[PDB]
Structures are given as C-alpha cells and as structure tokens.
Amino acid sequence: PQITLWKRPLVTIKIGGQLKEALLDTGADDTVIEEMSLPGRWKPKMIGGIGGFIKVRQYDQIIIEIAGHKAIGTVLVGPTPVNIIGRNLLTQIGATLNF
Amino acid sequence: PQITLWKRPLVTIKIGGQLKEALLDTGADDTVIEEMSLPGRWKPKMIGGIGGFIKVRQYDQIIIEIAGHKAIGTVLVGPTPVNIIGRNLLTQIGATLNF
Numbered sequence: 001p002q003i004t005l006w007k008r009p010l011v012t013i014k015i016g017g018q019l020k021e022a023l024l025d026t027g028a029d030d031t032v033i034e035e036m037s038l039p040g041r042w043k044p045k046m047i048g049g050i051g052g053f054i055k056v057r058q059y060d061q062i063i064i065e066i067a068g069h070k071a072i073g074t075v076l077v078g079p080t081p082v083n084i085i086g087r088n089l090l091t092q093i094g095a096t097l098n099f
Numbered sequence: 100p101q102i103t104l105w106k107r108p109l110v111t112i113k114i115g116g117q118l119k120e121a122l123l124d125t126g127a128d129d130t131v132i133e134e135m136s137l138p139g140r141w142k143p144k145m146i147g148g149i150g151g152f153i154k155v156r157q158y159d160q161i162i163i164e165i166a167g168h169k170a171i172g173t174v175l176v177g178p179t180p181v182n183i184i185g186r187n188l189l190t191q192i193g194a195t196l197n198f
C-alpha cells in the first residue's frame with residue numbers, strides 16, 4: 001500500500017496475542033508499545049526524546065504482525081503516550097519513504 | 100527518492116539561508132527545530148513527546164527547503180533533541196509511506 005501523510009499513519013498490529021493501534025514512525029529507531037506482558041526475558045533500558053527519558057523493558061525476538069505483514073525484532077514496553085512502530089520493524093516489512 | 104529505513108532518514112534542510120540536518124519523521128504531526136532566529140511573531144504551543152512536554156515557539160509561513168524541495172509552512176522552535184520534519188511539511192513535499 002501507499003499511505004499518505006495528511007493524517008497520522010496508524011495501523012493495526014498484532015503483538016502478544018493482542019490487537020493494538022500503532023503509529024508507523026520513521027523518526028523512531030525502536031518500537032515502543034504501551035504496558036503489556038510479553039513472554040521471555042527482558043532487560044531495562046532508558047530511551048529519550050522530546051520531554052526527556054522513560055524507562056522501558058526490552059524484549060528481543062518478538063513476532064509482530066504490522067498491517068498484515070509479519071516481522072520479528074526487539075520491542076520496548078513502557079509508558080509511551082502512543083504505540084510506535086520504529087525503523088527496526090519498518091525495515092522488515094519493506095517500508096520506504098517516497099517523494 | 101525512495102528512502103529505506105536501515106539508517107535514520109536524515110536530510111539537509113535550508114532555513115534562514117543556513118543548512119541544517121533534520122529527520123524525516125512520519126510520527127511527528129509538526130516540524131520542530133532547535134533554537135534559531137526566525138522572522139515575525141510567534142505563538143505559543145506545547146508538544147507532547149515520549150518523555151513529557153516542551154514549550155515551543157510557533158512561527159507560521161516560514162520558507163524552508165527539505166532535501167531540495169521547497170516548502171512554506173509552520174515551524175516550531177524549541178529544545179528538541181533533533182531537528183524533526185513532521186507531516187505538515189512532509190505533505191508539502193509529496194511524501195508517502197510505501198510497503
């Protein structure tokens with residue numbers, strides 16, 4: 001598909017058996033999801049943008065389905081205001097910016 | 100161009116006759132640039148990021164070139180940790196996400 005940018009590029013994702021809405025975010029290195037349980041091990045991490053830093057849990061090798069497309073990668077879980085699909089997963093679904 | 104996402108989508112912008120580096124950011128509604136001088140009056144705005152809010156200065160109808168593409172629109176100036184080109188200007192340069 002081709003997604004215009006007149007409004008926020010929100011898509012449905014499936015993660016951890018749950019459906020969520022998330023933002024396709026080319027300005028995000030990493031994928032950051034609101035609080036949820038995920039299986040396996042994790043380790044703490046600090047990530048920082050506008051307004052400062054938040055503490056998250058880093059889970060590796062997590063399968064996600066993004067707008068119908070499966071990928072695997074690291075997911076960060078914590079108190080983000082918005083669920084964000086970052087470049088680590090956008091690359092895996094073949095997403096590009098075109099102009 | 101067609102920009103892949105294996106690295107940050109950084110481009111050169113020109114604003115006020117000066118070149119700067121900025122991030123093409125589909126997760127940003129608005130364009131936010133580090134402290135600089137812009138002409139005219141400004142209005143107040145708050146923008147919510149992952150770590151909290153910053154106050155910024157809103158300047159309207161600013162001439163800005165993004166990767167060689169001319170735009171004229173709203174620029175927010177404040178203590179952002181990187182220069183961000185958001186959807187208000189990505190739409191002016193005809194950018195889409197594709198996969």
Ligand SMILES: CC(C)CN(C[C@@H](O)[C@H](Cc1cc(F)cc(F)c1)NC(=O)O[C@@H]1C[C@@H]2CO[C@@H]3OCC[C@H]1[C@H]23)S(=O)(=O)c1ccc2nc(NC3CC3)sc2c1
Nearest residue numbers: 027028029030048049050126127128129146147148149180
């Ligand atoms: C968090 C998103 C929902 C929103 N952000 C855009 C992001 O793309 C942002 C853009 C960004 C902001 C920043 F401060 C530094 C940076 F490197 C990139 N990424 C970011 O915060 O990522 C974090 C900082 C690292 C970079 O990527 C890594 O993985 C993602 C999690 C973190 C780390 S933002 O920068 O806070 C932003 C930009 C414009 C904007 N415009 C707004 N307008 C108001 C009407 C609503 S709110 C608003 C918020």
Ligand SMILES: [Cl-]
Nearest residue numbers: 072073074088
């Ligand atoms: Cl990853």
Ligand SMILES: [Cl-]
Nearest residue numbers: 091094103104
């Ligand atoms: Cl590729």
Ligand SMILES: [Cl-]
Nearest residue numbers: 172173187188
């Ligand atoms: Cl604008």
Ligand code: NA
Nearest residue numbers: 040041060061
């Ligand atoms: Na894991």
